[PDB]
């Protein structure tokens, strides 16, 4: 798609087909995140691709929204992408947590790239973070910044991405696994 | 330009031509920011377009980088875009300052939009925030999140309420 058309088409999607994500399209979305700007070109975040239904259920239960729409989007999509950061990598710059800025930038590349590849997303930032860390086996010194479902909507210094992309569990390589 | 091509083409630019920014392209870039997602669709930020050379010099002097490259990018481009946020509008969600997340999202829409439109940018986050608030007459309870030069490299919200010229509160649109 054309760039401005991607910006215009992006919306928060809560209803998804069960259609499987194309692996090549997913890896292009992650590549778009890998190409995001960051402070001092440090990359204080990694992404966990969550495909296990049991883990979706854990994430759904952890979400703290007024309505169940976000929880259901996670239940009812083929996968969820979770953005996890290390606050100590770059620390604070002029009174601001750099990790929040840099991880937000990269996650918007995920979101816009999904839209470009014909997939819906929905920013989710409100959750019991401890519960998500327990589900995904994330060390407690890291921060869960945001997550999003990924699916087809219902009609209604070159980084090696392999170091930055996990499947279901923190530390388990997406690209090296029989996923 | 194709979406993926903009992503790949984006780079930090430090050297610029003097060429004036096209107004219509600038407003298209801000529009792209207006369409950014945010928590509860609140918009805790606004943008100051800085065109005054005196103010560019104030900003250049406020930047706190090891090298002078960023300072010079602000001096030698036709304008700089400054993102200013209100922490108290949405506050914190799950131990995180929503304003930083949301402002960063929208600033990346201006960075990418700039690239789409043929202009370079450079994220600048390290500065004497007080000096920039002084220069741009920003109330002290707000935060300067980031800024970027905008220029040609060498070699349903109404954006009117979210876009200022040179000084906080002075409408870009409604000004000559």
Coordinates of C-alpha atoms in Angstrom, one line a residue:
Chain A
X1 CA 0.0 0.0 0.0
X2 CA 0.8 3.7 -0.5
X3 CA 2.1 5.4 2.7
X4 CA -0.6 8.0 3.4
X5 CA -3.3 5.3 2.6
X6 CA -1.7 3.1 5.4
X7 CA -2.0 6.0 7.9
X8 CA -5.6 6.6 6.9
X9 CA -6.6 2.9 6.9
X10 CA -5.2 2.1 10.4
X11 CA -7.9 1.7 13.0
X12 CA -8.4 -0.2 16.3
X13 CA -9.8 -3.6 15.4
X14 CA -11.5 -5.8 17.9
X15 CA -13.0 -8.4 15.6
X16 CA -10.9 -10.9 13.7
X17 CA -11.2 -13.8 11.4
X18 CA -9.3 -17.0 12.5
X19 CA -7.3 -16.9 9.3
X20 CA -3.6 -17.7 10.0
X21 CA -1.0 -15.0 9.7
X22 CA 1.4 -15.4 6.8
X23 CA 4.9 -16.0 8.2
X24 CA 6.6 -13.8 5.6
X25 CA 4.2 -10.9 6.2
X26 CA 4.8 -11.2 10.0
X27 CA 8.6 -11.1 9.5
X28 CA 8.2 -8.0 7.3
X29 CA 6.2 -6.3 10.1
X30 CA 9.0 -7.1 12.6
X31 CA 11.6 -5.8 10.1
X32 CA 9.7 -2.5 10.0
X33 CA 10.1 -2.3 13.8
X34 CA 13.8 -3.2 13.5
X35 CA 14.2 -0.2 11.2
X36 CA 12.6 2.2 13.8
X37 CA 14.8 5.1 15.2
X38 CA 15.9 4.8 18.8
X39 CA 18.0 6.9 21.2
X40 CA 21.7 6.3 20.5
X41 CA 20.5 3.5 18.1
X42 CA 20.1 1.2 21.2
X43 CA 17.2 -1.3 21.0
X44 CA 16.0 -1.6 24.5
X45 CA 13.0 -3.8 23.6
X46 CA 12.1 -7.2 22.2
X47 CA 8.8 -8.7 20.9
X48 CA 7.1 -11.9 21.9
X49 CA 4.8 -13.4 19.3
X50 CA 2.1 -15.2 21.4
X51 CA 0.4 -18.1 19.5
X52 CA -0.5 -20.5 22.2
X53 CA -4.2 -20.4 23.1
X54 CA -3.5 -21.0 26.7
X55 CA -1.3 -17.9 26.8
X56 CA -3.9 -15.8 24.9
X57 CA -6.3 -16.8 27.7
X58 CA -3.7 -15.7 30.3
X59 CA -3.3 -12.3 28.5
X60 CA -7.1 -11.9 28.1
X61 CA -7.5 -12.4 31.9
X62 CA -4.8 -9.8 32.7
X63 CA -6.3 -7.0 30.6
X64 CA -7.8 -4.2 32.8
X65 CA -10.3 -2.4 30.6
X66 CA -13.8 -1.2 31.4
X67 CA -15.2 -3.5 28.6
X68 CA -14.2 -7.0 27.5
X69 CA -13.6 -6.0 23.9
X70 CA -9.7 -6.0 24.2
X71 CA -9.7 -9.3 26.1
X72 CA -11.9 -10.8 23.3
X73 CA -9.6 -9.4 20.6
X74 CA -6.7 -11.3 22.1
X75 CA -8.8 -14.5 22.5
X76 CA -10.2 -14.4 19.0
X77 CA -7.2 -13.5 16.9
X78 CA -4.5 -15.9 15.6
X79 CA -1.7 -14.2 17.6
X80 CA -0.8 -11.3 19.9
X81 CA 2.5 -9.3 19.8
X82 CA 3.8 -8.2 23.2
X83 CA 6.5 -5.4 23.4
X84 CA 8.9 -5.9 26.4
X85 CA 11.6 -3.3 27.4
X86 CA 14.6 -2.9 29.6
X87 CA 14.4 0.5 31.4
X88 CA 18.1 0.2 32.3
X89 CA 19.5 -0.1 28.9
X90 CA 19.3 3.6 28.0
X91 CA 17.7 4.9 31.2
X92 CA 16.4 8.5 31.4
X93 CA 17.0 11.4 29.2
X94 CA 16.0 15.0 30.3
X95 CA 13.5 13.6 32.8
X96 CA 11.9 11.1 30.4
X97 CA 12.0 7.3 30.3
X98 CA 13.6 6.7 27.0
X99 CA 12.5 3.1 26.9
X100 CA 8.8 4.2 26.7
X101 CA 9.5 6.6 23.8
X102 CA 11.6 4.1 21.9
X103 CA 9.4 1.1 22.4
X104 CA 6.3 3.2 21.5
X105 CA 8.0 4.2 18.2
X106 CA 8.8 0.6 17.3
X107 CA 5.3 -0.7 18.3
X108 CA 3.7 2.0 16.0
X109 CA 5.9 0.5 13.2
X110 CA 4.4 -2.9 14.1
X111 CA 0.9 -1.4 14.0
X112 CA 1.3 0.5 10.8
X113 CA 3.1 -2.4 9.1
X114 CA 0.3 -4.8 10.1
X115 CA -2.1 -2.4 8.4
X116 CA 0.1 -2.3 5.3
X117 CA 0.1 -6.2 5.2
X118 CA -3.8 -6.3 5.5
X119 CA -3.9 -7.1 9.2
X120 CA -5.8 -5.4 12.1
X121 CA -4.3 -4.4 15.4
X122 CA -5.4 -2.7 18.6
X123 CA -3.1 -0.9 21.1
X124 CA -3.5 -2.4 24.6
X125 CA -1.6 -0.7 27.4
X126 CA -3.7 -1.5 30.6
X127 CA -3.1 -4.8 32.2
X128 CA -1.9 -6.6 35.3
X129 CA 1.7 -6.6 34.2
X130 CA 2.8 -9.2 36.8
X131 CA 0.3 -11.7 35.4
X132 CA 1.6 -11.2 31.8
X133 CA 5.2 -11.6 33.0
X134 CA 4.2 -14.8 34.8
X135 CA 2.4 -16.1 31.7
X136 CA 5.3 -15.3 29.2
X137 CA 8.2 -16.0 31.7
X138 CA 9.5 -12.5 31.5
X139 CA 12.2 -11.5 34.1
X140 CA 10.6 -9.1 36.7
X141 CA 13.3 -6.4 36.0
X142 CA 11.8 -5.8 32.5
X143 CA 8.6 -3.9 31.6
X144 CA 5.6 -4.9 29.5
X145 CA 5.0 -1.8 27.5
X146 CA 2.0 -2.7 25.2
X147 CA 0.5 -5.6 23.3
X148 CA -1.8 -6.0 20.3
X149 CA -3.8 -8.7 18.7
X150 CA -2.9 -9.4 15.0
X151 CA -5.4 -10.8 12.5
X152 CA -7.4 -10.3 9.4
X153 CA -10.3 -8.0 10.4
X154 CA -13.8 -9.2 10.2
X155 CA -15.7 -7.2 7.5
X156 CA -17.8 -5.7 10.2
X157 CA 24.3 -1.3 12.1
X158 CA 21.8 -3.9 10.9
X159 CA 20.1 -5.8 13.7
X160 CA 19.5 -9.5 13.5
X161 CA 15.7 -9.7 14.2
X162 CA 16.3 -13.2 15.5
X163 CA 17.8 -11.6 18.7
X164 CA 14.7 -9.5 19.2
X165 CA 11.8 -11.9 18.4
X166 CA 10.5 -14.7 20.6
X167 CA 7.7 -17.2 20.4
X168 CA 5.3 -17.8 23.4
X169 CA 8.1 -17.5 26.0
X170 CA 10.8 -14.9 26.7
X171 CA 14.2 -16.2 25.4
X172 CA 12.7 -18.8 22.9
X173 CA 13.7 -17.8 19.4
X174 CA 10.8 -17.3 17.0
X175 CA 12.9 -17.9 13.8
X176 CA 14.9 -20.9 15.1
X177 CA 11.8 -22.7 16.4
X178 CA 9.5 -25.2 14.7
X179 CA 6.7 -22.7 15.5
Chain B
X1 CA 5.8 6.3 -1.9
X2 CA 4.9 2.8 -0.9
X3 CA 4.6 2.3 2.9
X4 CA 7.5 -0.2 3.3
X5 CA 9.7 2.1 1.1
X6 CA 9.2 5.1 3.5
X7 CA 10.1 2.9 6.5
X8 CA 13.4 1.8 4.7
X9 CA 14.2 5.3 3.5
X10 CA 13.8 7.0 6.9
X11 CA 17.2 8.1 8.3
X12 CA 18.5 10.7 10.8
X13 CA 19.4 13.7 8.7
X14 CA 21.8 16.4 10.0
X15 CA 22.5 18.3 6.8
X16 CA 19.8 20.3 4.9
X17 CA 19.2 22.7 2.0
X18 CA 17.8 26.2 2.7
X19 CA 14.7 25.3 0.6
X20 CA 11.4 26.4 2.1
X21 CA 8.9 23.8 3.3
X22 CA 5.8 23.6 1.3
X23 CA 2.8 24.6 3.4
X24 CA 0.5 22.0 2.0
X25 CA 3.0 19.2 2.6
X26 CA 3.6 20.4 6.2
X27 CA -0.2 20.3 6.9
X28 CA -0.4 16.8 5.4
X29 CA 2.4 15.7 7.7
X30 CA 0.5 17.1 10.8
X31 CA -2.7 15.4 9.6
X32 CA -0.8 12.1 9.6
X33 CA 0.0 12.8 13.3
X34 CA -3.7 13.7 14.0
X35 CA -4.6 10.2 12.7
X36 CA -2.2 8.6 15.3
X37 CA -3.8 6.2 17.8
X38 CA -3.8 7.3 21.5
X39 CA -5.0 6.0 24.8
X40 CA -8.8 6.5 25.0
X41 CA -8.4 8.7 21.9
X42 CA -7.3 11.6 24.1
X43 CA -4.7 13.9 22.5
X44 CA -2.3 14.9 25.3
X45 CA 0.1 16.7 23.0
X46 CA 0.4 19.7 20.6
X47 CA 3.1 20.7 18.1
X48 CA 5.0 24.0 17.8
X49 CA 6.3 24.8 14.4
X50 CA 9.4 27.0 15.0
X51 CA 10.4 29.1 12.0
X52 CA 12.0 32.1 13.8
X53 CA 15.8 32.0 13.5
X54 CA 16.2 33.6 17.0
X55 CA 14.1 30.7 18.4
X56 CA 16.1 28.1 16.4
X57 CA 19.2 29.6 18.0
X58 CA 17.7 29.3 21.5
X59 CA 16.8 25.6 20.8
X60 CA 20.3 24.9 19.3
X61 CA 21.8 26.3 22.5
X62 CA 19.5 24.1 24.7
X63 CA 20.4 20.8 23.1
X64 CA 22.7 18.5 25.3
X65 CA 24.5 16.1 22.9
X66 CA 28.2 15.2 22.9
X67 CA 28.6 16.6 19.4
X68 CA 27.1 19.8 17.8
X69 CA 25.4 17.9 14.9
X70 CA 21.9 18.1 16.3
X71 CA 22.3 21.8 17.3
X72 CA 23.5 22.5 13.8
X73 CA 20.6 20.6 12.2
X74 CA 18.2 23.0 14.1
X75 CA 20.2 26.1 13.0
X76 CA 20.5 25.1 9.3
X77 CA 17.0 23.7 8.5
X78 CA 14.0 25.9 7.6
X79 CA 11.9 24.9 10.6
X80 CA 11.9 22.6 13.7
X81 CA 8.9 20.8 15.1
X82 CA 8.6 20.5 18.9
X83 CA 6.2 18.0 20.6
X84 CA 4.8 19.3 23.9
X85 CA 2.6 17.1 26.2
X86 CA 0.4 17.4 29.2
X87 CA 1.2 14.5 31.7
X88 CA -2.0 15.1 33.7
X89 CA -4.4 14.7 30.8
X90 CA -4.3 10.8 30.8
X91 CA -1.8 10.3 33.6
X92 CA -0.3 6.8 34.1
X93 CA -1.5 3.4 33.0
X94 CA 0.0 0.2 34.5
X95 CA 3.1 2.0 35.8
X96 CA 3.7 3.9 32.5
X97 CA 3.4 7.5 31.6
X98 CA 0.8 7.5 28.8
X99 CA 1.9 10.9 27.6
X100 CA 5.4 9.6 26.5
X101 CA 3.9 6.6 24.7
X102 CA 1.2 8.7 22.9
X103 CA 3.4 11.7 22.1
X104 CA 6.1 9.3 20.7
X105 CA 3.6 7.5 18.4
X106 CA 2.4 10.9 17.0
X107 CA 6.0 12.2 16.6
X108 CA 6.9 9.1 14.6
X109 CA 3.9 9.8 12.3
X110 CA 5.4 13.3 11.6
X111 CA 8.9 11.7 11.1
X112 CA 7.6 9.1 8.7
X113 CA 5.3 11.6 7.0
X114 CA 8.2 13.9 6.5
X115 CA 10.1 11.1 4.8
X116 CA 7.1 10.4 2.6
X117 CA 7.0 14.1 1.6
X118 CA 10.7 14.3 0.7
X119 CA 12.0 15.9 3.9
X120 CA 14.5 14.7 6.4
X121 CA 14.2 14.7 10.2
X122 CA 16.3 13.8 13.2
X123 CA 14.9 12.8 16.6
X124 CA 16.2 15.0 19.4
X125 CA 15.3 14.1 23.0
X126 CA 18.2 15.5 25.1
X127 CA 18.0 19.2 26.0
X128 CA 17.7 21.7 28.7
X129 CA 13.9 21.5 28.8
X130 CA 13.6 24.7 30.9
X131 CA 15.5 26.7 28.2
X132 CA 13.2 25.4 25.5
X133 CA 10.1 26.3 27.6
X134 CA 11.5 29.8 28.1
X135 CA 12.1 30.2 24.4
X136 CA 8.7 29.0 23.3
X137 CA 6.7 30.3 26.2
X138 CA 5.5 26.9 27.2
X139 CA 3.8 26.6 30.7
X140 CA 6.1 24.9 33.2
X141 CA 3.6 22.2 34.0
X142 CA 3.9 20.8 30.5
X143 CA 6.7 18.6 29.1
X144 CA 8.8 19.0 26.0
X145 CA 9.0 15.4 24.8
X146 CA 11.1 15.7 21.6
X147 CA 11.8 17.8 18.6
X148 CA 13.1 17.5 15.1
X149 CA 14.5 19.7 12.3
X150 CA 12.5 19.6 9.1
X151 CA 14.0 20.3 5.6
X152 CA 15.2 18.9 2.3
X153 CA 18.3 16.7 3.0
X154 CA 21.6 17.8 1.4
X155 CA 23.0 15.5 -1.4
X156 CA -12.2 13.9 14.2
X157 CA -9.7 16.5 15.3
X158 CA -9.1 19.9 13.7
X159 CA -5.4 20.3 13.6
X160 CA -5.8 24.0 14.2
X161 CA -6.3 23.4 18.0
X162 CA -3.0 21.2 18.0
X163 CA -0.6 23.3 15.9
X164 CA 1.2 26.5 16.9
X165 CA 3.7 28.8 15.3
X166 CA 6.8 29.9 17.3
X167 CA 5.0 30.4 20.6
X168 CA 2.8 28.2 22.6
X169 CA -0.9 29.2 22.1
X170 CA -0.4 31.1 18.8
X171 CA -2.4 29.3 16.1
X172 CA -0.3 28.2 13.0
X173 CA -3.4 28.1 10.8
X174 CA -5.0 31.3 11.8
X175 CA -1.8 33.3 11.5
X176 CA -0.4 35.1 8.5

